Design a protein around this ligand. Structure first.
Ligand SMILES: [Mg+2]
Ligand SMILES: [Zn+2]
Lengths: 50, 150, 50, 1316, 251, 66, 50
RNA sequence: CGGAGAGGUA
């Protein structure tokens, strides 16, 4: 990331746009809740404003 | 720049810019122009400079600033005179009056006479008046057949 | 060039004699092009004075 | 030794030098350059990777976000090549970059991460080079030629006394970056030194010396030495350096240690210096007159008062010397100047320099670069910083730094891109050194100073130009608000990449329309070296020295193939073996010569290195031990050909044809032509029309096959095998089992391009040259292209030529042609035009293309269909209606007046959103049938392939022949067989089959959507119909035809068969040239080719005779073996004893029309071998036979030359040229006739043709041709009425182009008027 | 002129005129308003610059441009240069009744004639043909005569061979260096497509037959035909005007 | 020289249609010059008979008629 | 336009012998000036010389 | 119709 080598979590949203979140801040991440671990949706990162 | 001053105190105004490896050429042109005209009475000169580059937009449309192939003033005064004479003679109400008592059917789906279809703005306006003032479906149908013919 | 092309056109020139031949015989065509462009102007000047 | 499909016709190669390096791929530069553009470079220094890493990572101004780069990938093109040409869209591939956007967090320490988002963002469409080297940019097939520009670096030139009239040479230096602002130093005739920047106003150099934080003292220490005075008790003791006195006239007593060494007025001899040093002289007393003209180095002031006494750069006088003595100064330092060795060339610049500090120096630099806007401190300082020392707005490339450190004799060939202080100082030192007398100037035409930037480098530069704007926009978008929900796709714009690349490919000076009336013309227009374009010289302002051929052109650039006319020597073409160096320079191979052996190892030498060594000649005799058979071998050492000793050579030329290009190495017997006539031979070979039935050249150079193979017109087998199916439009190759793949085995399918239209309206169609069920190998041609013949170039026909004058019908250059040449349709060529009819959208509404057109009968509509479009196959003539179009109130497309031809193709384009008429539905319907049918044939021939492989693999372990067909061909999986690697392979093949099913379904549906969809068109057009006309132009008096040796000439009579001079056997001569064209312009190559062609047809005639009366193969084998022998130690050595006794019956079948011969260009057939071959046939060995006249029947005296000469038919037909006009349209602003043949134009009776009528007394002809026939409208209507009314007479009036002149002059403030 | 896409051509003169008229009307209004002097001064500066660019653009070191960054074409740029009125429309100009074609030899000719393709001879000589057809009454108007020539019945070829009897045509090769570069020849009709040229006048024309082209003009009036026959026929140009030596040398 | 001997002509069209048209026109417009059409080039310009050959008799009687 | 750069009352009629507003459309009125718009109905080639 | 550019014939 420009001078630091880190470990990240790998998250795939819609259109295969990947989001890496640090392992120092994994508490920002929660498990799923709708009871649809096979029927879960997928949002698009950054919205569809553009 | 005009926000400062306003009283006898000498008032400075700074225009900080990013480091010039990422400023477009038009930006330095604008900045050097606005730093050149640091005097009093510079406003009108700057406005008539902005015009002449930007160019006045449509005289009878929106879009205030831009070349974009307006209608001519010499045409516009004649068009307006024709409108004035037809209006006063006819004494029809304004289009806005036909907007005022209009039971609003804003269904936000396009509804107008397209420009190429009736190019003469005056005649198209006359159809606007006669349509929105038509108070019988038979009158509407007569408008429809006359417009189909014409 | 000190050494000549000692080979005629009945016998064949070899490679290096032919390269020197081209040395000589492109100057001719370049000269022809630009001398034509100049002499046209010269005769235009001559016509317009007389 | 031979293949199966070279044994069809073995060209009998003459020539004695054994080749040590085969001709490379002739399109190496184009394909290699564009490969370096688009290829994943791991090391990251070429192409898109270099550009992306040169821009990214993009760090925001805030610094809390940056946009870094991961990888790039080129998508599949939406259309293939053919659909890109037809549909009118460029052939490009979407570039997709996997950008990765990091986001920082604020309150954390410097450098953390909040999130990182990556997304494969789409940016740019980059056009893809096709398989050959041609791009498709808007349906038109373009070629980007390589450019030859002066290499970035530093060059020391001098006008050879062109100014100042003193004979004074004004040495100058240019620092020329790859990208940035130039820099120049020069010398005023007063031996000063001035700098100039970007060819602006000249300034003293010391201004830029001061600009670099150099004050005067360090400047003087840089450019000058020191002479030390120590004032003591005896009269100015000076430490004297004896080598400071080499070569000056003395001025006083030269003594030391009580002994007189040299006396006054003497020249200080070398022995005087030796006396001084052997006596070890150091300290000399000198008089005071010696110091009155010397200039002190630095500042000596008074210590007490703190006041300046003497400053830097001023001469010392007696009063100054007294003051410096009185200030306690003991040591003085002055400058060692001179008059021939070390001039004071910088001190006078200081004197003339009106600048003393550095800030004011930056001030007048600011004043120079932009007049107006009086400077500040920071503005001038930043301007001068970013002008020469910013990696943003200035860059020497690695080639720039290489040439820079080379010219200054430095060591490292790497360094920073931008300049530095030591570099500028070293340049100025080297310029002063050149001026003094050491060193040497450069020639700027050396091929060690001009380098090639072909397609890859140029397009990468434009990509980088776009990427700069992209990264600027990215930086602004990052510094704007709301970072934490941005994504890279919503951040970058793909507009300024696609714009900067489409602008270069479409509209540039070096991306030009491909010449396509040959395979040769294509392949020699791709290997073009333009010396023009951006960053290069101008066509009409180029002198006699850059147009000329330099001694370093040898091996790199052809000396003969250049156009004649205004750009000669500017449009050079590459040699055969030349490559581009790693830095863009040109290099050519050379065999390394060891101690005494000419080895087989080759080294590619550039043009700088070629000068140091000594290189042998291409044909210098060496004999089976690598030893030269002479001791004075003609070599070239340093641009000087001369005879050298045998034990001194370092290199040898690879082959005799590395000096000439590809265009001028298909000329046989080139070594007998003049250079001018070979130039014209090459340039007319480049224009030969591909005729109807291509005909091999009986006398070639063996390079024919290379040009046929590398120019992508022949369909060449990618993998060997057996031809399963032949058709005039497709060829199916069942590939060999060892050339198979395990997964996706399949078989190859080649679709031959039938009669499509080339750029120059000729016809390019391919013909199958293989038979059904015939073995082919990898790299073997399967379809002849245009003007090829079994895989070898055949630009024209080869005809029986007699050299004699014939009743004046071949007077100057003309050609008299027999009528068999036109009866046999051997010069009948097909020309395919594309006539377009567009449907606009104008005032009073649009136009339809119905058949309903007024004032024309049903004969007009008999050729149109019901939809208004002409029928395919309708033989139209001039003036007919192809697409009936009406004007809304007759705008029908009509054939141009004069041209016939058959409609062969109608393409209908329609804008999306408007319904398609009947013809569009019919055409789209047959297109849908064609597309579904072709994909079905693809899938089912692949079904045949997969099921054949499945059946043929089960020979062991599972073979039951009935059980294959007891159930149908599909279900060949669940039969009884071992579940081992055999059933593994059957599962793999079935999975491949099902994937092929799915691929066929997807491809068919995608093709249907692609066909049916509306297409983008110009705003304002509704639908376009393009009719295609095929015209068989035969031949007639007028059609220029030529040979290969520069002997052109328009055919002047189509003479009946029986008038042609027949020899004693009755055979008429086919073409009667003129002898008088040989002695003046010395192309003896045509006569030698004539003799050798006669020999080849003699061998062919004997083989044909032995074949007509049927004779056994033991006679044909014997005769053909004698024919393929008979070289005097040639390198061919083909044995007929290993031929299969039936490929002899095929070889002799192909040789029955003439035994083809190769003659390598500078290694040709000597005359003795020609006579011997003519004597193997029964022909008379002097070459000339006796011809009887065709008409009187009585023999010609003085037996004439007949032979077989290869005639091309150049593309200057007389159908295209001939034009006439009586009255037609007239121009608008001036009422003169229009101009051209497309318009009904009238010829320009110009200025010279008016003087030519003034020279006669013909004033009435002049008056009508400049009033009545042209311009006076009331004169010309009256003239037309007077001509029709039988009264030839004019009323002149006054031309309206003079009334226009009156109104234009009078429309200034200039009252011009006519008097009474 | 319309560009056939619904819009109009630029036509730089009208652009300069619009610029001048706009500045002038603005200045007239601003002078009517008695505006302060700092504004009217640079208004007059702008008007002076505009009229300057109209009369002769580029005579200042600064030149104003439109498209492609080249300066506009002012009223002085329409007279100067190789493309002005004087050198491109007045001294030499395009001409009706003219043709152009390749040249072949035709050594059967006599010194005073030239071959001429039947197609060119019909196209150049249309009005004379119309006159002769209306003299025969074969089509008693110019429209019917027009269709009649267009169809090329067998009778219009006789009309040619009569209207080409004594009617010289001026053959002309492209670099007309000297007065023997344009010479008049009586035509001989040829079923071909190339202007045959008598092989003695090649030296005068400096014409090899290696692909050259020659233009053919027609003299119309009686004065022009007599000028051709008396002054410009090839049987008068035997001595060279540069020196008394012959120019009909057997080559 | 022939370049200057043709610009320094009494006829301001035989020098305007030569080179330097702007300079010739200004210098001859300040001076109020008059062209008598007495040459072979300005008669070509104004589209009338050349005073050389078959136009010589025409110009001869035209001059003698005034 | 009315009195623009291209004009019909200042320079002349656009079509041969025709008014601007079509009030006079035949050559039998050559020379009269219309009243509504004010063009001189004459030959359109006077647009070249005015 | 103009402008820019490329190439070719003599
Ligand atoms: Mg010629
Ligand atoms: Zn009117």
């Amino acid at each position: 990331a420009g001078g630091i080598t880190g470990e990240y979590l790998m998250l795939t949203y819609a259109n295969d746009a990947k989001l890496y979140v640090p392992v120092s801040s994994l508490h920002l991440i929660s498990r799923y809740a709708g009871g649809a671990e096979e029927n879960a949706p997928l949002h698009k990162l950054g919205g569809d404003a553009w | 720049r005009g926000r400062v001053g306003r009283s006898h105190h000498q008032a400075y105004a700074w225009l900080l810019t990013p480091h010039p490896k990422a400023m477009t050429t038009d930006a330095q042109k604008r900045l050097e122009a606005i730093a050149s005209l640091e005097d009093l009475g510079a406003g009108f000169a700057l406005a008539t400079h902005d015009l002449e580059i930007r160019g006045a937009g449509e005289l009878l449309g929106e879009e205030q600033s831009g070349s974009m192939e307006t209608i001519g003033f010499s045409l516009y005064m004649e068009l307006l005179e024709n409108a004035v004479d037809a209006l006063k003679a006819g004494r029809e109400p304004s289009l806005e009056d036909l907007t005022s008592q209009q039971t609003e059917v804003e269904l936000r789906m396009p509804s107008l006479l397209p420009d190429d279809f009736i190019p003469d703005v005056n005649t198209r306006l006359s159809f606007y008046k006669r349509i929105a003032s038509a108070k019988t479906e038979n009158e509407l149908e007569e408008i429809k057949v006359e417009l189909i013919d014409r | 060039i000190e050494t000549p092309i000692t080979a005629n056109f009945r016998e064949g020139l070899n490679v290096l004699q032919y390269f020197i031949s081209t040395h000589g015989a492109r100057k001719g065509l370049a000269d022809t092009a630009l001398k034509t462009a100049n002499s046209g102007y010269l005769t235009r000047r001559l016509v317009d004075v007389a | 030794v031979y293949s199966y499909t070279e044994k069809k016709r073995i060209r009998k190669d003459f020539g004695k030098r054994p080749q040590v390096l085969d001709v490379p791929y002739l399109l190496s530069i184009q394909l290699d350059s564009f490969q370096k553009f688009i290829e994943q470079d791991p090391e990251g220094q070429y192409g898109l990777e270099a550009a992306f890493r040169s821009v990214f990572p993009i760090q925001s101004y805030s610094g809390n976000s940056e946009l870094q780069y991961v990888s790039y990938r080129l998508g599949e093109p939406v259309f293939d090549v053919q659909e890109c040409q037809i549909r009118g869209v460029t052939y490009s591939a979407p570039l997709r970059v996997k950008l990765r956007l990091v986001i920082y967090e604020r309150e954390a320490p410097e450098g953390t991460v909040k999130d990182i988002k990556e997304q494969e963002v789409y940016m740019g469409e980059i056009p893809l080079m096709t398989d050959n080297g041609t791009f498709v940019i808007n349906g038109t097939e373009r070629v980007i030629v390589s450019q030859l520009h002066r290499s970035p670096g530093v060059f020391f030139d001098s006008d050879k006394g062109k100014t100042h009239s003193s004979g004074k040479v004004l040495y100058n230096a240019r620092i020329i970056p790859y990208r940035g602002s130039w820099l120049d130093f020069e010398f005023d005739p007063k031996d000063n030194l001035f700098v100039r920047i970007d060819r602006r106003r000249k300034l003293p150099a010391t201004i830029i010396l001061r600009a670099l934080n150099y004050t005067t003292e360090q400047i003087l220490d840089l450019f000058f030495e020191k002479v030390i005075f120590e004032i003591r008790d005896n009269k100015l003791q000076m430490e004297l350096v004896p080598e400071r006195l080499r070569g000056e006239t003395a001025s006083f007593d030269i003594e030391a240690n009580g002994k007189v060494y040299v006396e006054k007025g003497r020249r200080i001899t070398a022995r005087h210096i030796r006396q001084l040093e052997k006596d070890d002289v150091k300290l000399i007393e000198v008089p005071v007159e010696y110091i009155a003209g010397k200039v002190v180095a630095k500042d000596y002031i008074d210590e007490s008062t703190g006041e300046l006494i003497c400053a830097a750069n001023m001469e010392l006088s007696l009063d100054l010397l007294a003051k410096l003595s009185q200030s306690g100064h003991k040591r003085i330092e002055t400058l060692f100047t001179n008059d021939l060795d070390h001039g004071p060339y910088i001190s006078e610049t200081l004197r003339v320099d009106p600048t003393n500090d550095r800030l004011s120096a930056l001030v007048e630099i600011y004043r120079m670069m932009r007049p107006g806007e009086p400077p500040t401190r920071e503005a001038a300082e930043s301007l001068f910083e970013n002008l020469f020392f910013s990696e943003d707005r200035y860059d020497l490339s690695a080639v720039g730094r290489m040439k820079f450190n080379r010219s200054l004799l430095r060591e490292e060939i790497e360094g920073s891109g931008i300049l530095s202080k030591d570099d500028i100082i070293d340049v100025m030192k080297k310029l002063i050194d050149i001026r003094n007398g050491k060193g040497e100037v450069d020639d700027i035409d050396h091929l060690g100073n001009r380098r090639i930037r072909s397609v890859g480098e140029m397009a990468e530069n434009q990509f980088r130009v776009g990427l700069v704007r992209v990264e600027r926009a990215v930086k602004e978008r990052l510094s704007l608000g709301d970072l934490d929900t941005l994504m890279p796709q919503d951040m970058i714009n793909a507009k300024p990449i696609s714009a900067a690349v489409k602008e270069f490919f479409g509209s540039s000076q070096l991306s030009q329309f491909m010449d396509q009336n040959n395979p040769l013309s294509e392949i020699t227009h791709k290997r073009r070296i333009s010396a023009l374009g951006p960053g290069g010289l101008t066509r009409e302002r180029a002198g006699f020295e850059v147009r000329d051929v330099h001694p370093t052109h040898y091996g790199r650039v052809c000396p003969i193939e250049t156009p004649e006319g205004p750009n000669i020597g500017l449009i050079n073409s590459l040699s055969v073996y030349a490559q581009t160096n790693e830095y863009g320079f040109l290099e050519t191979p050379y065999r390394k010569v060891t101690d005494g052996v000419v080895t087989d190892e080759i080294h590619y030498l550039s043009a700088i290195e070629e000068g140091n060594y000594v290189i042998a000649q291409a044909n210098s005799n060496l004999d089976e031990e690598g030893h030269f058979v002479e001791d004075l071998v003609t070599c070239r050492s340093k641009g000087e050909s001369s005879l050298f000793s045998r034990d001194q050579v370092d290199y040898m030329d690879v082959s005799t044809q590395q000096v000439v290009s590809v265009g001028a190495s298909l000329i046989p017997f080139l070594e007998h032509d003049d250079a001018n006539r070979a130039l014209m031979g090459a340039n007319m070979q480049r224009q030969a029309v591909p005729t109807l039935r291509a005909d091999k050249p009986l006398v070639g150079t063996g390079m024919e096959r290379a040009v046929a193979v590398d120019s992508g017109v022949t369909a060449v087998a990618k993998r060997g095998g057996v031809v399963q199916y032949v058709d005039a439009s497709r060829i199916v190759i069942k590939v060999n089992e060892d050339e198979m793949y395990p997964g996706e085995a399949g078989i190859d399918i080649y679709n031959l391009t039938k009669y499509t239209r080339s750029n120059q309206n000729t016809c390019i169609n391919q013909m199958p040259c293989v038979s059904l069920g015939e073995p082919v190998e990898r790299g073997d041609v399967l379809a002849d292209g245009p003007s090829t013949d079994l895989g070898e170039l055949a630009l024209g026909q080869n005809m029986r030529v007699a050299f004699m004058p014939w009743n004046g019908y071949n007077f100057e250059d003309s050609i008299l042609v027999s009528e068999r040449v036109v009866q046999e349709d051997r010069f009948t060529t097909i020309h395919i035009q594309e006539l377009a009819c567009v449907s606009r959208d104008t005032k009073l509404g649009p136009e339809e293309i119905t058949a309903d057109i007024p004032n024309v009968g049903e004969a007009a509509l008999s050729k149109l269909d019901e939809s208004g479009i002409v029928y395919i196959g309708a033989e139209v003539t001039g003036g007919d209606i192809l697409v009936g179009k009406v004007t809304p109130k007759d705008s029908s497309l009509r054939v141009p007046n004069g041209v016939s031809g058959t409609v062969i193709d109608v393409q209908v384009f329609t804008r999306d959103g408007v319904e398609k008429d009947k013809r569009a539905l019919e055409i789209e319907e047959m297109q849908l049938k064609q597309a579904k049918k072709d994909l079905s044939e693809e899938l089912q021939i692949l079904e045949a392939g997969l099921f054949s492989r499945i059946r043929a693999v089960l020979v062991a372990g599972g073979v039951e022949a009935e059980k294959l067909d007891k159930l149908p061909r599909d279900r060949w999986l669940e039969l009884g067989l071992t579940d081992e690697e055999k059933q593994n392979q059957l599962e793999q093949l079935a999975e491949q089959y099902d994937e092929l099913k799915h691929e066929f379904e997807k491809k068919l549906e995608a093709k249907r959507r692609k066909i049916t969809q509306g297409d983008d068109l110009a705003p304002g057009v509704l639908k376009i119909v393009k009719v295609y006309l095929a015209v068989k132009r035969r031949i007639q008096p007028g059609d220029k035809m030529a040979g290969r040796h520069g002997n052109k000439g328009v055919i002047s009579k189509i003479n009946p068969i029986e008038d042609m001079p027949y020899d004693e056997n009755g055979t008429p001569v086919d073409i009667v040239l003129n002898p008088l064209g040989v002695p003046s312009r010395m192309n003896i190559g045509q006569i030698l080719e004539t003799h050798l062609g006669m020999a080849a047809k003699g061998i062919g005639d004997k083989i044909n005779a032995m074949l007509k009366q049927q004779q056994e193969v033991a006679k044909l084998r014997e005769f053909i073996q004698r024919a393929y022998d008979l070289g005097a130690d040639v390198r061919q050595k083909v044995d007929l004893s290993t031929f299969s006794d039936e490929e002899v019956m095929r070889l002799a079948e192909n040789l029955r029309k003439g035994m083809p011969i190769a003659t390598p260009v500078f290694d040709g057939a000597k005359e003795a071998e020609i006579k011997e071959l003519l004597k193997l046939g029964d022909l008379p060995t002097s070459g000339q036979i006796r011809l009887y006249d065709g008409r009187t029947g009585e023999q010609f005296e003085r037996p004439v030359t007949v032979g077989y000469m290869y005639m091309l038919k150049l593309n200057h037909l007389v159908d295209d040229k001939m034009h006439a006009r009586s009255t037609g349209s007239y121009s608008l602003v001036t009422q003169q006739p229009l101009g051209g043949k497309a318009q009904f134009g009238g010829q320009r009776f110009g200025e010279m043709e008016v003087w030519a009528l003034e020279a006669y007394g013909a004033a009435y002809t002049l008056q009508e041709m400049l009033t009545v026939k042209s311009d006076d409208v009331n004169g010309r209507t009256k003239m037309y009425k007077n001509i029709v009314d039988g009264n030839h007479q004019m009323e002149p009036g006054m031309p309206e182009s003079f009334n226009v002149l009156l109104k234009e002059i009078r429309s200034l403030g200039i009252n011009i008027e006519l008097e009474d | 002129v319309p560009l056939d896409g619904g819009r109009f051509a630029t036509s730089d003169l009208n652009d300069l005129y619009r610029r001048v008229i706009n500045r002038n009307n603005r200045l007239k209004r601003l002078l009517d308003l008695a505006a302060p002097d700092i504004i009217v001064r640079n208004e007059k500066r702008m008007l002076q610059e505009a009229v300057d660019a109209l009369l002769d653009n580029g005579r200042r070191g600064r030149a104003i441009t439109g498209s492609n960054k080249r300066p506009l074409k002012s009223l002085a740029d329409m007279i100067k240069g190789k493309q002005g009125r004087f050198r491109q429309n007045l001294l030499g100009k395009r001409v009706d009744y003219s043709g152009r074609s390749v040249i072949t030899v035709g050594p059967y000719l006599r010194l005073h004639q030239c071959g001429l393709p039947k197609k060119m001879a019909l196209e150049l000589f249309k009005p004379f043909i119309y006159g002769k057809l209306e003299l025969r009454g074969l089509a008693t108007t110019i429209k019917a005569a027009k269709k009649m020539v267009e169809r090329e019945e067998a009778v219009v070829w006789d009309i040619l061979d009569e209207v080409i009897r004594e009617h010289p045509v001026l053959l002309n090769r492209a670099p007309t260096l000297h007065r023997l570069g344009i010479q008049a020849f009586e035509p001989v009709l040829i079923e071909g497509k190339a202007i045959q040229l008598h092989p003695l006048v090649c030296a005068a024309y400096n014409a090899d037959f290696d692909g050259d082209q020659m233009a053919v003009h027609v003299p119309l009036t009686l004065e022009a035909q007599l000028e051709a026959r008396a002054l410009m026929m090839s049987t008068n140009n035997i001595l060279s005007p540069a020196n008394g030596e012959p120019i009909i040398v057997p080559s | 020289g022939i370049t200057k001997a043709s610009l320094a002509t009494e006829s301001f069209i035989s020098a305007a249609s030569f080179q330097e048209t702007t300079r010739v026109l200004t210098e001859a417009a300040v001076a109020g010059k008059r062209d008598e059409l007495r040459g072979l080039k300005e008669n070509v310009i104004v589209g009338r008979l050349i005073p050389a050959g078959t136009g010589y008799a025409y110009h001869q009687d035209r001059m003698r008629r005034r | 336009e009315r009195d623009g750069l291209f004009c019909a009352r200042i320079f002349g009629p656009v079509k041969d012998y025709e008014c601007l507003c079509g009030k006079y459309k035949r050559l039998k009125h050559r020379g009269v000036i219309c009243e509504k718009c004010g063009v001189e109905v004459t030959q359109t080639k006077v647009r070249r010389e005015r």
